[PDB]
Amino acid sequence: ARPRVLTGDRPTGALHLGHLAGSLQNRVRLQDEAELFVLLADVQALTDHFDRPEQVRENVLAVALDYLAAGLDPQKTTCVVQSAVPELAELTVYFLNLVTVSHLRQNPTVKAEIAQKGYGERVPAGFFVYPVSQAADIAAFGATLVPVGDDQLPMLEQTREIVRRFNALYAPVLAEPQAQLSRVPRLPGLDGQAKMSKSLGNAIALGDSADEVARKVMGMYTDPGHLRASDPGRVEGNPVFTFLDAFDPDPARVQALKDQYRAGGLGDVKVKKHLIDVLNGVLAPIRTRRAEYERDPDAVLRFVTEGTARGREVAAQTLGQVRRAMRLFGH
Amino acid sequence: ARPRVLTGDRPTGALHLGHLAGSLQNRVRLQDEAELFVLLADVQALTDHFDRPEQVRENVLAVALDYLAAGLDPQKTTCVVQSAVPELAELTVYFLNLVTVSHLRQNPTVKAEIAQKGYGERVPAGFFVYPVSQAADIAAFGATLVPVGDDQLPMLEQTREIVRRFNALYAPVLAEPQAQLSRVPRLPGLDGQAKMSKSLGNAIALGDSADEVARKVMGMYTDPGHLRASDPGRVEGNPVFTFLDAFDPDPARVQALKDQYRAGGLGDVKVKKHLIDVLNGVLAPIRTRRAEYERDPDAVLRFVTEGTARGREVAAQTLGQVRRAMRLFGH
Ligand SMILES: N[C@@H](Cc1c[nH]c2ccccc12)C(=O)O
């Protein structure tokens, strides 16, 4: 617990295996060697789900359950609800003056999201400026370390430019955050697509039963040109093997399987059955905790209402120095 | 009283003659005909003076002074410092999700301000976004009536739209404000321009001495082509006549000079000399009232502090409604 680390998820659905490999495992490690803050960004979730406020509200507790199921320790990690800390909103408006529409339009990750969203020019204001509200999140909690995939770096770098702009303009009162680069490639979906997502219908939820997990793995995309076991098959592009590199505890088995698969005679069945065994080993403890916490709804609520109290107090302090530094009337 | 009315100014310096005919005397009278709220747009002032925070801080008290000297009574008007009502920033963020960047791009007023400031695509986000920040000001205070210059209509109309969209998506807890059009269009500068402002240096501040007011009138743009008295003059484009038209109580008397001046025996000096006194007359009491308060600074502070508390009270009430209407986790 030395550097304060900030991470988070906009609450829009249940977490899945992609989040586990992409951010959860690394977060369970961080809680023991840093002070970890996780933001349930329901406000940010609203920049594009403003038409589905029920969906957002219900997922705040569902993702919290997922964090805990994942292994995030209520006595180690501060879980906070963005909605319950208005200090963030207050800070993002001040931050809006430190950035240009021009530079906001150049952000490559938002540009790509809008592209995939098909918005066109009909981009909702809140979404267009969300990178700043995130900057507000980082500075307010006073995080100095932010886990990031290269897809979020422009979010992070802008944060850096903003804090830098704020300190030089008013007074050097905000910490400059540093990135904790990557998590190695993103977990592809069950049918082989680049992205794993509920929406795309190719995911395995952390909450999926051991049976379901087995079924989902069975119908996984493999190798279009591999038609029967005797045939040789390709590893690259084949998610069954991409899943194995991200969860299989022993690469010896992994590399061995890869061998015999390019050879021939090793059907998808024997490989997949082995995937099932490795996934059930990573997931079983996550399923037990999740079921346990289900019996203890009060324990999950305590997890968030308390992280929130802490988060509120921290953000409140920062705004105090921000207000004074900005020379705001009465400070 | 009856309706709630929201009016305000961006604290950037002393108020002048344009605010007077522009609204100050208007609110002086709607001050007992309704519940009048006057917002010192502290934050909105930063989307333009984010690099000169000191300038803003200093003018909150100076404009409040201006307010009081203009005739506003502490017992009937709620003076509110924007920055001290964080609830407004909270509501602004939520409103941002209700409008598109392309819609903000077609606001004629902001577009003109932007071209004048030479920002180009390098427009500060906070500024490009100020119209909705204003809609939040309106919606948070429950304002049903908003006096508006011909010029501020786009903004007023965007407010109703957003309020409307907010009510349909979430719940009908916000009121659509209605406009109060004025007669005297934007009082022009001494310059002969369309705008009077301390920035353009063509303004007669409410604090200027009988000597100054007289000196400013004498250097006031009139009519080229009219070189000597004798000659015939014309009222179109002459700030002095559009000054008499907004500050002179005897229209029969005005339309009088309008005759003679088109003929040729009314020297611009004579027009001026008259008008200068019609201004000292409208200004005389304002000057004495200012001295009183200038000698009771404690009272100006009071006006601001008490009002700001009252207004936050009001904002807090509406936000509670908004927060529950949006189904934000926990409400
Ligand atoms: N996926 C979200 C996660 C998030 C929300 N707010 C944050 C603040 C800091 C770090 C991450 C976040 C994002 O793109 O940002």
HEC letters along B288-316: HHHHHHHCCHHHHHHHHHHHHHHHHHHHH
* Cβ proximity of A124 and B169 under 8 Å: no
Token readout for A160 is: 């850096």
* Cβ proximity of A183 and A26 under 8 Å: yes
Domains with residue ranges and CATH for chain A? 1-199+297-331 (3.40.50.620), 200-296 (1.10.240.10)
**Contact residues for A93 (Cβ-Cβ < 8 A; gap 6+):** B43, B89, B92, B93, B126, B133
B90 in reach of chain A (CB within 8 A): yes
Paired with A80 in beta bridges are A39
Number of helices followed by number of strands (H, E) in chain A? 15, 5
Extract long-range pairs of B317-321: CB within 8 Å, 24+ residues apart: B318/B87, B318/B91, B318/B139, B318/B140, B318/B141, B318/B142, B318/B173, B318/B174, B319/B87, B319/B90, B319/B91, B319/B140, B321/B173
Between chains, do B94 and A46 touch, taking CB under 8 Å as contact?
A: yes
Ligand 1 atom closest to the Cα of residue A147 is: 10
DSSP one-letter code for A205: B
Nearest residue of chain B to residue A168 (CA atoms): B51
| C-alpha R_g of chain A | 22
A109 Cα–ligand 1 center, Å: 12
Cα four-point dihedral sign B88, B94, B96, B99: negative
Q: Is A9 in the pocket of ligand 1 (CB under 6 A)?
A: yes
Nearest residue of chain A to residue B329 (CA atoms): A57
Token readout for B249 is: 């109580």
β-strands B145-148, B35-40: how paired? unpaired
- Going from the C-alpha of A157 to that of each of A149, A252, B51, the distances in angstroms are 12, 39, 22
Closest to A261 measured CA to CA, from A244, A249, A281: A244
The span from the CA of B166 to the CA of B173, in Å, is 9
Between chains, do B81 and A122 touch, taking CB under 8 Å as contact?
A: no
**Contact residues for B240 (Cβ-Cβ < 8 A; gap 6+):** B217, B220, B222, B268, B271, B272, B275
A260-271 per-residue burial string, b: 16 or more CB within 10 A, e: under 16? ebeeeebbbeeb
* Cβ proximity of A155 and A8 under 8 Å: no
As for chain A, the residues directly before each break of C–N over 2.5 Å are none
Chain A contacts in chain B segment 211-240 (CB below 8 A)? none
The span from the CA of B11 to the CA of B7, in Å, is 13
Token readout for B108 is: 């004629």
Closest to B176 measured CA to CA, from B34, B22, B4: B4
β-strands B145-148, A35-40: how paired? unpaired
The span from the CA of B307 to the CA of B328, in Å, is 29
Q: Which amino acid is residue A306, in one-letter code?
A: E
Nearest by CB: B328 against A42, A326, A329? A42
Paired with B77 in beta bridges are B36
Q: Which amino acid is residue B192, in one-letter code?
A: G
User: Residue B16 phi/psi, 5° resolution?
Assistant: -125, -170
B6 CA to centre of own chain = 11
Chain A contacts in chain B segment 140-199 (CB below 8 A)? 169-170
Chain A contacts in chain B segment 110-129 (CB below 8 A)? 120-129
The span from the CA of A312 to the CA of B284, in Å, is 51
Between chains, do B93 and A51 touch, taking CB under 8 Å as contact?
A: no
Q: Give the 3-state secondary structure of residue A45.
A: helix
Give the angle A143-A21-A188 at the CA atoms, nearest 5°. 125
The span from the CA of B313 to the CA of B321, in Å, is 13
Find tokens 């979906």 and name the residue: A189
**Contact residues for A285 (Cβ-Cβ < 8 A; gap 6+):** A71
User: Residue B205 phi/psi, 5° resolution?
Assistant: -65, 150
A66 in reach of chain B (CB within 8 A): no
The span from the CA of A25 to the CA of A35, in Å, is 16
Q: Is A44 in the pocket of ligand 1 (CB under 6 A)?
A: yes
Nearest residue of chain B to residue A59 (CA atoms): B329
The answer to whether B198 is annotated as binding is yes
CB-side neighbour CA atoms (13 Å) of A287: 15
Ligand 1 atom closest to the Cα of residue A82 is: 6
Nearest by CB: A81 against B132, B327, B329? B329
The span from the CA of B169 to the CA of A43, in Å, is 16
Interface test with A, best of B134, B328, B331 (most A CBs within 10 A): B328
Rounded to 10 degrees, the C-alpha dihedral B60/B62/B68/B71 comes to -110
The alpha-helical segments, DSSP class H, found in B170-231 are 210-218
Token readout for A257 is: 């399987």
The span from the CA of B163 to the CA of B177, in Å, is 9
Could you tell me the resolution of this structure in angstroms?
2.1
Q: Is A41 in the pocket of ligand 1 (CB under 6 A)?
A: yes
Rounded to 10 degrees, the C-alpha dihedral B218/B221/B223/B229 comes to 10
Closest to B137 measured CA to CA, from B18, B302, B312: B312
Question: Other CB atoms closer than 10 Å to residue B7's CB: what's the count?
Answer: 20
The span from the CA of B261 to the CA of A173, in Å, is 63
The span from the CA of A126 to the CA of A36, in Å, is 27
* Cβ proximity of B160 and B176 under 8 Å: yes
Q: Give the 3-state secondary structure of residue A119.
A: coil
- Chain A positions in Cβ-Cβ contact with residue B56 (cut-off 8 Å): 327, 329
Token readout for B36 is: 């009048």
Paired with A225 in beta bridges are none
DSSP one-letter code for A36: E
Token readout for B292 is: 């009183």
The span from the CA of A197 to the CA of A13, in Å, is 10
Token readout for A40 is: 């349930």
The span from the CA of A282 to the CA of B50, in Å, is 51
- Chain A positions in Cβ-Cβ contact with residue B61 (cut-off 8 Å): 329
Give the angle B59-B60-B65 at the CA atoms, nearest 5°. 90
Token readout for A230 is: 């005797």
* Cβ proximity of B31 and B83 under 8 Å: no
The span from the CA of A241 to the CA of A189, in Å, is 12
Nearest residue of chain A to residue B51 (CA atoms): A169
Closest to B191 measured CA to CA, from B221, B215, B214: B221
Closest to A200 measured CA to CA, from A190, A210, A208, A209: A190
Nearest-Cα distance to chain B for A164, in Å, is 14
A159 Cα–ligand 1 center, Å: 12
Experimental technique of record = X-ray
The span from the CA of B155 to the CA of B163, in Å, is 12
Find tokens 């793995």 and name the residue: A217
* Cβ proximity of A142 and A320 under 8 Å: no
DSSP one-letter code for A124: B
